[PDB]
Amino acid sequence: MQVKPCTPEFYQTHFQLAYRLQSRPRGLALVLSNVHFLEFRSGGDVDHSTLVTLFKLLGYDVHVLCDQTAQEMQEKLQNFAQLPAHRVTDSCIVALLSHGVEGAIYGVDGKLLQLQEVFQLFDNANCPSLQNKPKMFFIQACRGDETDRGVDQQ
Amino acid sequence: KMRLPTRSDMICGYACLKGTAAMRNTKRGSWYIEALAQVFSERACDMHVADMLVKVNALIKDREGYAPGTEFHRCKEMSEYCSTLCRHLYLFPGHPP
């Protein structure tokens, strides 16, 4: 994997109408993968390595967590949101990879963590260090059991 | 002085839609992560994040399940993102050199 850098000219012509994003590191990133539980998530190891590599190449300081219970996810996400480094970085990334249901993801104990609770940890009230800074979340989890059979294109 | 809403400046990419299953290849990993890494590595230099997630959506719409003899053969998935961003989000990778 390689990330093509932006040109100096691209930066000069776009930075004024964009979020400030020039800190080094660009931000902290958290990649939290649950694979062992709800069936074993075969290929979850590939996803995890792919994102760790990607965010490192994008200039993020990457934190990793694996196979966490719902309670541990909550506690460790809160710890992550409260890190002092957020004041001096320009953005934040959180990737969560697990089984899930609409609006929640599973811990390895089969208990659910509500996504609203996750987002709240990073909001303007609870995470003042990230106020006005872009916060990215990527959620790889089912949101229901309905398989999409697909439809014919007319 | 200007105050803030309780929550703002977030963008959330979801592998699938409300009520549906997200697909994962047992060897190659999740369709959504594979697409996300392909697009972001290629385009973060000149495309903002919401626009890159649109490219991810295009890739996911096009893919289909390969799982002969199960309910997942030729199945589909659609990703989405939701945004409370108030500006373009460019990652400006490798700047300054």
Partner: peptide
């Protein structure tokens, strides 16, 4: 093969 998360 493809499976559901």
């Amino acid at each position: 093969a493809d499976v559901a998360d």
